[PDB]
Amino acid sequence: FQYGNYCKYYDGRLRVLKPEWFRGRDVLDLGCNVGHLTLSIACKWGPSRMVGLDIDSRLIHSARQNIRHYLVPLDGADTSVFPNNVVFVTGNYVLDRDDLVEAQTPEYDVVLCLSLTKWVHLNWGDEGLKRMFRRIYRHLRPGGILVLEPQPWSSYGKRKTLTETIYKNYYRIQLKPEQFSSYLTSPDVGFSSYELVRPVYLFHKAR
Ligand SMILES: Nc1ncnc2c1ncn2[C@@H]1O[C@H](CSCC[C@H](N)C(=O)O)[C@@H](O)[C@H]1O
């Protein structure tokens, strides 16, 4: 469970997230896990498109089986209403090179990156996390928002001995959680502004 990839059930987060951010918008949920939040938002708040992405296919299978527990669209040609507005995909959001990140064209209005930063940081280092952040920016359409819930540096130490890669990265990291807001709003990423809503932040892409 080196990617934090075990089945996590909590959702209290819907009290902090605002429905207006999601209604009629295209949403990408990074590290969706078993997709309880993906399904709750997709159902309760009507996004036009909701995609849940996770590296672990066992979580994606479970997420797809969970659709039945949440159960109206007119038929298959109507993808505007739950359950026809949600899909799950297995994949690593972290691209290998910077030239690959630059090939990403916009597709979403909202990107949810909740409790993911630590797992990405430990497994793929500063380089990998910078690439995830830059990809989120490039994937968002002008006017888009990134919902970020990062883990504090204090959380990194515990289980730094999971992998040899995780250990080498824990001692090589220079971009610390406390510096994430400044990095995301820098020319390296591009976000125009940020705000505070673990703590939850909103990063804005210029219209
Ligand atoms: N590079 C990556 N790409 C996609 N998913 C990733 C990833 N690294 C880790 N993950 C997934 O992200 C999750 C971290 S746990 C956070 C779960 C959820 N977003 C929440 O807030 O409850 C795990 O399910 C893990 O498998």
UniProtKB/Swiss-Prot annotation:
Tissue specificity of this protein: Expressed in chronic myeloid leukemia cells, adrenal gland, brain, cerebellum, kidney, lung, mammary gland and testis. Weakly or not expressed in other tissues.
Domain of life per record: Eukaryota
Parent-protein start and end of this portion: 413 to 685 of 689
Purpose of the protein: S-adenosyl-L-methionine-dependent methyltransferase that adds a methylphosphate cap at the 5'-end of 7SK snRNA (7SK RNA), leading to stabilize it. Also has a non-enzymatic function as part of the 7SK RNP complex: the 7SK RNP complex sequesters the positive transcription elongation factor b (P-TEFb) in a large inactive 7SK RNP complex preventing RNA polymerase II phosphorylation and subsequent transcriptional elongation. The 7SK RNP complex also promotes snRNA gene transcription by RNA polymerase II via interaction with the little elongation complex (LEC).
Compartments in which it is found: Nucleus
Bin3-type SAM domain span: 11-207
Covalent link (Glycyl lysine isopeptide (Lys-Gly) (interchain with G-Cter in SUMO2)) residue numbers: 176
The protein's name in its UniProt record: 7SK snRNA methylphosphate capping enzyme
Outcome of mutating residue 118 to A: Decreased methyltransferase activity
Assembly and oligomerization: Core component of the 7SK RNP complex, at least composed of 7SK RNA, LARP7, MEPCE, HEXIM1 (or HEXIM2) and P-TEFb (composed of CDK9 and CCNT1/cyclin-T1). Interacts with METTL16. Interacts with RBM7; upon genotoxic stress this interaction is enhanced, triggering the release of inactive P-TEFb complex from the core, yielding to P-TEFb complex activation.
Family to which this protein belongs: Belongs to the methyltransferase superfamily.
Species, as recorded: Homo sapiens
Binding positions (S-adenosyl-L-methionine): 10, 13, 31-33, 54-55, 92-93, 114
